[PDB]
Amino acid sequence: GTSKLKYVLQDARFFLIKSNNHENVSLAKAKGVWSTLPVNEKKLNLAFRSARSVILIFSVRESGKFQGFARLSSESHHGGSPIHWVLPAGMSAKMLGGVFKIDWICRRELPFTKSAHLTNPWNEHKPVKIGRDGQEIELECGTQLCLLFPPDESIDLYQVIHKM
Secondary structure (H helix, E strand, O other), rough: HHHHHHHHHHHEEEEEEEEOOHHHHHHHHHHOEEEEEHHHHHHHHHHHHHHHHHHEEEOOOOOOOOEEEEEOOOEOOOOOOOOOOOOOOOOOOHHOOOOOEEEEEOOOOEEEHHHHHOEHHHOOEEEEOOOOOOEEOOOHHHHHHHHHOOOOOOOOOOHHHHHO
8 A cells, every 4th residue: 555655755855866887776775774975964953853754866877767766864974884985086985974874665666657747846847757856746746756656565664664
């Protein structure tokens, strides 16, 4: 069913996360963590304190798809388990901000062809697939986008509901 999902998404905030490679999304799916540049780290930390749920919707650049979505379970923190991210050409890990813990809500993919009717008012009403890493997605657009994904029957939202 979709009812617990709708409950988790009620009055949520949504952010588009654009990854350069599948390796980083795979690591995030396995370890339940994400790290971003400090400009986005600050926005996500503000969002986490501000809303019942902050949802990250992931897309690997040039893949033509979203790869899933997850809910922040913490603000960013430093000094944890080091994460062997594949960093872009020239980037160092010291350039990253802290690490966010995340709980995956859906690890299934959604092709952009299926989200073409969804526009994001906070990015000039462009199709929601269009946006820089960290672009906030307006509530209605983000809710409908998350509801388009195939259900992930491996995930039980009971545990996530208890963290809200």
